[PDB]
Symmetry: C2
Subunit: 316 residues, 2 copies
């Protein structure tokens, strides 16, 4: 079935992973070097062996596509995936004077009542970014994140490069380019960044009127992250083919370090005893073709019938 | 045998390649998305089914490692692999006034006597870069090429980043980093470059005291280029393990577009009827461990016994 490359990836890390230490006190089993291929004409690769919230993928990807780096857009769509990087900065300012909250995730996981302390400070930071304009400008903007490295890469001469907008032009004029590459890795920035881009680089390829994309992901959390990763880039591939008037081909997912955190072994073993359903179907608005102006409403998933969600500990 | 992933790559492009147009009037058969893995403890992957000149790989890689962008070093080692990019620029200057030589390779392949005209202008440019210092500074320096994007990436603040030297420090202090990445792709430069880097990005990984490297190559010429590509990065992997005091693991080769030019089909079919020999053995100087100061003399290949070289038309 279409998601089978993901269950073979998870099964291979179980059989052959190296127990490896990492940043987090949670350990991992990992491999280095892996590739998976999904043929997007056979169906959209959103996992049916576990319920994955597509609306978070769909809103986070439009945020990227709009060139946006401000949390407010996401919080407006009720997407909280990036709230911690921005909350983190609220907490070091000489403006924040509440409970101490240091390396918040760690203490909020082995949580005292500190979890709802963390969760009320966060509820407060989130509301302030929604309604307070100058607060949103100051603390809601992450600055260096995929919206801006895709669409507004900074030059040494001080202007900006819309790499995604120019590669879409090169695909419409020069489909056979072996140079349709978008990079999110910038050597200058990467020492001071907190999370240097996990989705380091991607490449488009056109052949026989079909568009494929290859992603190079330098680090991947197999249970929690990769099911989102898959669907975000299979949806980028669909969107750029819409705009360019091409059929969709394959999404090829290449990995550097792919890892399973040790406290996700039971959950992934259980997911592995489930049997793939028939894959969902993406529907993109046939009358809008400028994907940078797309809206939530413009992408539909039809027939997604998944198994239950599987609750797992986030690694810290 | 160790080189078998390369003969399976060539055989797969023969069976499944898409005939694809490209820049050159020579056409290609290509695929998109491929990975190959070579275990460097089993032997050095220099192809034995065709004689590959290791001394060109060894001198070109030290040029990169030294941070060098000047042809003179290569010409001094009798390596002419990069002479055309620099000759190309000699030819547009208001200093060159000889025969016209425009897009030289094309006319020198379907060559009149113009080949030895091209070849005497080149013999002249090459000698001038060897002995004339200010000419070498002006026309021998390529400027943006792997020595400088590995070792002297330019910032917007105007200094330089030695990405390779800092990633070797991060491996010695933080071997478990999922961030040991060197990028040769720079969005700023890549529109004006003539040949934007083919070896776009690489990543190191350490586990159980063994160092692996993964290369992402956006475009690969299977008959002529990839046998060099393989051996240059398997030698980078050996050199960084020497300097870091690690054992060598694997070299993983990931491909975006891999292509066989149409006028190399007979030659690769013939190479494919040859049987792999036992692979050579690399010997690195045991008493020098700063690889940036290595010299030709410091790397030995023992037991390389290959089949004959296979002459093929370069694509234009």
């Amino acid at each position: 079935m279409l998601e089978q490359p993901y269950l073979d990836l998870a099964k291979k890390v179980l059989d052959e992973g190296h127990f490896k230490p990492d940043r987090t006190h949670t350990g991992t089993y990992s491999i280095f070097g892996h590739q998976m291929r999904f043929d997007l004409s056979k169906g959209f690769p959103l996992l049916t062996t576990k319920k994955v919230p597509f609306g978070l993928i769909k809103s986070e990807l439009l945020w990227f596509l709009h060139g946006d780096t401000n949390i407010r857009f996401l919080l407006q769509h009720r997407n909280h995936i990036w709230d911690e990087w921005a909350f983190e900065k609220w907490v070091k300012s000489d403006e924040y004077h509440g409970p101490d909250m240091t390396d918040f995730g760690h203490r909020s996981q082995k949580d005292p009542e500190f979890a709802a302390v963390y969760h009320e400070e966060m509820a407060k930071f989130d509301d302030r970014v929604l309604h307070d304009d100058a607060f949103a400008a100051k603390y809601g903007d992450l600055g260096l994140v995929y919206g801006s490295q895709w669409r507004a890469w900074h030059t040494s001469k001080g202007d900006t490069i819309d790499q995604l907008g120019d590669v879409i032009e090169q695909i419409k004029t020069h489909p056979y380019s072996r140079r349709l590459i978008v990079s999110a890795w910038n050597p200058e920035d990467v020492p001071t960044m907190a999370l240097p881009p996990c989705h380091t680089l991607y490449q488009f390829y056109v052949n026989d009127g079909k568009l494929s994309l290859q992603l190079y992901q330098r680090s991947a959390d197999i249970f929690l992250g990769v099911p989102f990763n898959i669907a975000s880039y299979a949806l980028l591939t669909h969107l750029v083919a819409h705009e360019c008037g091409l059929e969709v081909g394959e999404f090829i997912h290449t990995f550097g370090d792919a890892h399973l955190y040790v406290n996700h072994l039971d959950q992934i073993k259980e997911q592995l005893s489930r049997t793939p359903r028939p894959a969902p179907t993406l529907q993109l608005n046939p009358d809008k073709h400028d994907i940078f102006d797309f809206d939530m409403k413009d992408i539909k998933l039809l027939n997604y019938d998944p198994y239950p969600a599987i609750k797992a500990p986030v690694a810290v």
